[PDB]
Amino acid sequence: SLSNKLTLDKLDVKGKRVVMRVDFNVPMKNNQITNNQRIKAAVPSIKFCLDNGAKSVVLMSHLGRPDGVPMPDKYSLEPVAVELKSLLGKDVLFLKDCVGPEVEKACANPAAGSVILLENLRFHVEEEGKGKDASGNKVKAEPAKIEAFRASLSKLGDVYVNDAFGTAHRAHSSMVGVNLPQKAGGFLMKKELNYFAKALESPERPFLAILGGAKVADKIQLINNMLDKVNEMIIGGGMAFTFLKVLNNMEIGTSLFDEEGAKIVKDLMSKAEKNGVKITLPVDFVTADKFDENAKTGQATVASGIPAGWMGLDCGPESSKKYAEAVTRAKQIVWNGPVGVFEWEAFARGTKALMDEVVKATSRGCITIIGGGDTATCCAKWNTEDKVSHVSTGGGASLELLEGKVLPGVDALSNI
Numbered sequence: 001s002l003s004n005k006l007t008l009d010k011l012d013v014k015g016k017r018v019v020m021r022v023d024f025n026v027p028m029k030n031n032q033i034t035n036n037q038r039i040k041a042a043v044p045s046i047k048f049c050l051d052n053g054a055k056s057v058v059l060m061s062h063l064g065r066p067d068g069v070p071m072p073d074k075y076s077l078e079p080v081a082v083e084l085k086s087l088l089g090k091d092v093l094f095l096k097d098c099v100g101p102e103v104e105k106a107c108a109n110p111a112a113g114s115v116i117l118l119e120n121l122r123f124h125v126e127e128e129g130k131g132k133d134a135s136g137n138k139v140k141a142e143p144a145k146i147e148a149f150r151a152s153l154s155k156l157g158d159v160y161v162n163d164a165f166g167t168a169h170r171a172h173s174s175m176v177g178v179n180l181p182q183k184a185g186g187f188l189m190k191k192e193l194n195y196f197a198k199a200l201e202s203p204e205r206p207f208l209a210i211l212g213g214a215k216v217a218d219k220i221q222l223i224n225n226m227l228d229k230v231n232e233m234i235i236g237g238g239m240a241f242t243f244l245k246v247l248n249n250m251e252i253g254t255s256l257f258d259e260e261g262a263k264i265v266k267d268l269m270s271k272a273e274k275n276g277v278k279i280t281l282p283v284d285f286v287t288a289d290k291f292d293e294n295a296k297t298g299q300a301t302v303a304s305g306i307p308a309g310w311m312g313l314d315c316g317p318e319s320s321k322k323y324a325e326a327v328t329r330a331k332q333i334v335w336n337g338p339v340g341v342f343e344w345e346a347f348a349r350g351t352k353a354l355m356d357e358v359v360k361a362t363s364r365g366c367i368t369i370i371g372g373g374d375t376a377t378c379c380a381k382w383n384t385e386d387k388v389s390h391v392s393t394g395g396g397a398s399l400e401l402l403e404g405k406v407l408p409g410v411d412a413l414s415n416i
Contacts, residue, residue: 001197002193002196002197002200002201002401002410003193003197003201004415004416005184005185005193005410005413005414005415005416006182006183006184006185006413006414006415006416007184007185007186007187007189007190007193008045008048008049008161008163008184008185008186008187008190009048009187009190010184010416011159011161011182011184013049013052013053013054013159014052014053014054015053015054015055016054016055016157016158016159017054017055017056017058017107017109017110017156017157017158017159018049018054018056018057018058018157018158018159018160018161019058019060019107019153019154019156019157019158019159019160019161019178019180020042020045020046020049020057020058020059020060020157020160020161020162020163020186021060021061021160021161021162021163021164021167021174021175021178022042022045022046022059022060022061022163022164022186023038023041023042023061023163023164023165023166023167023188023393023394024038024039024042024059024061024062024063024077024080025038025061025062025063025064025166026038026039026063026080028063028079031076031079032079033079033080033083036083036087038393039080039083039084039087040087041188041393042059042163042186042188043087043088044187044188045161045163045186045187045188046059046088046115047088048187049161050090050113050115053112053113054113055109055110055112055113055114055158056107056110056113056114056115056116056157057114057115057116058107058116058118058156058157059084059115059116059117059118060098060118060121060153060156060174061077061080061117061118061120061121061164062120062121062122062127062167062174063075063076063077063080063120063122064120064122065122066120066122066123066131067122067125067128067131067132068122068123068124068125068126068127068128068130068131068132068133068139068141069123069125069131069132069133069134070123071120071123072096072119072120072123075120075122075123076119076120077094077117077118077119077120078094080117081093081094081117084115084117088115090113090115091115092115092116092117093106093110093114093115093116093117094116094117094119095116095117095118095119096119097118097119097123098118098119098120098121098123098124098152098153099124099149099152099153100152103118103152103156104152104155104156107155107156107157108155118156121172121173121174124141124149125139125140125141125145126141126145126146126148126149126150126173127149127172127173127174128141128170128172129141129146129171129172129173146173146177149173149177150173150177150178150179151179153173153174153177153178154177154178154179154180157180158180158181159180159181159182159183159184160178160180160182160183160184161183161184161185161186162175162183162184162185162186162189162409162412162413163185163186163187163188163189164189164409165188165189165192165392165393165394165397165409166372166393166394166395166396166397167394167397167409168189168394168397168407168408168409168410169394169396169397169400169401169405169407169408169409170408170409171408171409172409175408175409175412176408176409176411176412178412182414183412183413183414184413184414185410185413188393189410189413191390192390192392192393192394192397192398193410195367195369195389195390195392196369196392196398196401198367199332199334199367199369200229200401200402203229203331203332203367204331204332204367205231205331205332206231206232206329206330206331206332207229207230207231207232207330207331207332207333207334208230208231208232208233208234208326208327208329208330208332208333208334209226209229209230209232209233209234209333209334209335209336210233210234210236210323210327210333210334210335210336210337210339210354210358211223211226211233211234211235211236211239211336211337212234212236212237212239212335212336212337212338212339212351212374212375213237213238213239213337214237214238214239214256215238215239215242215256215258215261216239216242216243216258216260216261216262216264216265217258217260217261219239220261220264221403221404221405222336222399222402222403223235223268224268224271225402225403225404226334226402227268227271227272227275227277228275230277230334231276231277231278232277232278232279232280232326232329232330233272233277233278233279233280234280234281234323234326234339235279235280235281236282236315236323236337236338236339236340236350236354237337237338237339237340238255238256238312239256239258239261240281240282240315241255241256241257241312242256242257242258242261242262242265243265243269243281244281244282244302245257245262246262246265246266247265247266247269247281248302250302250305250306251305251306251307252305252306252311252312253287253305253306253307253308253309253310253311253312254306254308254309254310254311255306255311255312256311278326280322280323280325280326282315282316282319282322282323282339283301283302283316283318283319283322284299284300284301284302284315284316284317284318284319285299285300285301285306285312285313285314285315285316285319286298286299286312286313286314286315286316286340286346286347286349286350287299287300287306287307287310287311287312287313288310288311288312288313288346288347289309289310290311291311291313293343293344293345293346294346295313295346297346298310299316300312300316301316301318313340313341313344313346313347314339314340314341314346314347314348314349314350314351315339315340315350316350319339319350320349320350320353320354320357323339323350323353323354323357324353324354324357327354327357327358327360327361327366328357328361330361330366331365331366331367332366332367332368332369333358333361333366333367333368333369334369334371334402335354335358335368335369335370335371335375336370336371336375336398336399336402337371337374337375338350338351338374338375338378339351339354342374342378342381351378352382355378355379355382355384358388359384359387359388362387362388362389363387366389367389368388368389368390369388369389369390369392370388370390370391370392371392371395371398371399371402372391372392372393372394372395372396372397372398372399373395373396373398373399374395376391376392376393376395379391
């Protein structure tokens with residue numbers, strides 16, 4: 001369950017050493033942070049621990065994919081220690097490793113209110129459990145070493161806090177390997193759990209899922225899980241063409257077509273009808289003569305078909321109206337995937353108009369949940385992160401949740 005989990009608000013940290021896993025996987029360039037959003041996001045949790053008299057806060061995280069190889073030249077967390085120092089307005093000790101006697105003893109009994117940032121966890125192959133060797137050959141962590149690695153991390157604090165929802169879909173040592181009495185979710189984790197639990201277990205209805213994507217076949221579990229829960233579903237983006245070919249005899253030109261997906265389209269529509277799920281597919285399109293930002297553009301409907309040598313890369317204005325109609329009917333929205341090639345201005349009007357609708361919906365009381373990845377990227381692009389109820393901080397994590405998969409990192413948390 002996503003509810004009934006221990007969270008930082010209810011965790012007593014008085015004189016307690018807090019070992020906290022956080023999301024410091026920031027984009028960087030020239031060994032500098034190009035966006036410190038994730039670093040700032042974790043501050044409320046860290047503040048709270050210090051402000052409630054925590055002896056220490058030991059921060060652990062990853063950066064990029066060194067793959068179990070120490071790469072402090074490239075993928076060091078030291079730049080983060082600096083930025084964190086500024087944001088907190090408090091000094092931050094940066095250790096050059098995350099495990100070992102040195103790290104351990106250093107974390108054993110810090111001065112009251114010590115912020116300690118450990119080095120990239122994925123410098124050790126034991127974090128992920130797999131990775132690459134010095135030479136770049138793939139390798140798997142030894143079980144004794146994994147256990148040793150996890151034992152070390154456990155010493156570094158008295159209580160554990162997981163504020164790294166974005167890695168909670170993986171059974172990594174820092175997610176499921178911290179053996180301590182109390183294992184609580186941080187305030188970021190809290191929000192994820194609070195929004196998703198309500199949405200998936202007790203939604204305000206109508207509940208609309210907006211699913212966008214390239215293919216169908218790789219979203220069977222996502223679509224199925226939503227069809228078990230929702231009242232309405234928009235199927236947008238390239239994948240819609242597979243539905244339209246099968247269902248409406250549509251000529252789709254060079255548009256994406258999912259041969260495997262096509263075989264279960266009618267199964268999906270059957271399930272949808274039986275569950276009372278109103279499906280909205282697009283009815284019109286902005287076409288392009290090639291898969292390119294600067295392609296020639298045109299229009300098409302289902303009826304007109306898309307000509308040979310043209311592909312659909314966005315929905316058209318009539319589609320956007322139909323999308324809006326469903327959004328206007330929603331009391332709850334989960335939006336996972338753009339409905340066009342939003343990174344190209346010529347094919348972004350559909351996704352932008354939908355984003356406008358979801359924002360409008362939010363303003364009149366709709367609960368709107370954006371999945372991580374592209375959909376979240378669209379909220380950053382158009383400055384609507386604060387205009388929707390919740391933008392998930394983890395793309396891979398949110399997908400797994402919406403697919404109804406297990407989140408090991410969440411399961412490892414204590415219950416209440």
